Design a protein around this ligand. Structure first.
Ligand SMILES: [Cl-]
Ligand SMILES: [Cl-]
Ligand SMILES: [Mg+2]
Length: 158
């Protein structure tokens, strides 16, 4: 099954963090990285000069069950980042989100696929469209269509 995973970092050298996260993701059992997007740059909300976010998307072929994949992504986040409690409202060392898992729809306390609000987050959709321009969401909506009809500025590259 192809899982699409969102990667985000705005602390401790994001280029270093995304690269470590990619390596970790690549090591997950019964899984293989199919494709990686370019790295995008998402500035913060606010003028106060806060660190920009590096965002990416990964196509991960996997024979794992969705909750099994989640066990590894959470593990990776916990081992590589999640250093201070403030990161939940503020800058983060590493965020790993499972965006999509094949055409599955999943709503458990643990795991919600498609990811919460992802259709309204260009920092997710732009890199996903780079690697999967023909993608169709589980409800039948085309990703391309979503980007042609919602108010997303083009994200600049890192
Ligand atoms: Cl850099
Ligand atoms: Cl959907
Ligand atoms: Mg392997």
């Amino acid at each position: 099954t192809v899982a699409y995973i969102a990667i985000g970092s705005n602390l401790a050298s994001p280029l270093e963090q995304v690269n470590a996260a990619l390596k970790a993701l690549g090591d997950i059992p019964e899984s293989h990285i199919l494709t990686v997007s370019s790295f995008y740059r998402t500035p913060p909300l606010g003028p106060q000069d806060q660190p920009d976010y590096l965002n990416a998307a990964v196509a991960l072929e996997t024979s794992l069950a969705p909750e099994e994949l989640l066990n590894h992504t959470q593990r990776i986040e916990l081992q590589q980042g999640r250093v201070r409690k403030a990161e939940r409202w503020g800058p983060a060392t590493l965020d790993l989100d499972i965006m999509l898992f094949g055409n599955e729809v999943i709503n458990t306390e643990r795991l919600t696929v498609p990811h919460y609000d992802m259709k309204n987050r260009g920092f997710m959709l732009w890199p996903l469209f780079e690697i999967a321009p023909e993608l169709v969401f589980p409800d039948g909506e085309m990703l391309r269509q979503i980007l042609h009809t919602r108010a997303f500025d083009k994200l600049n590259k890192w």
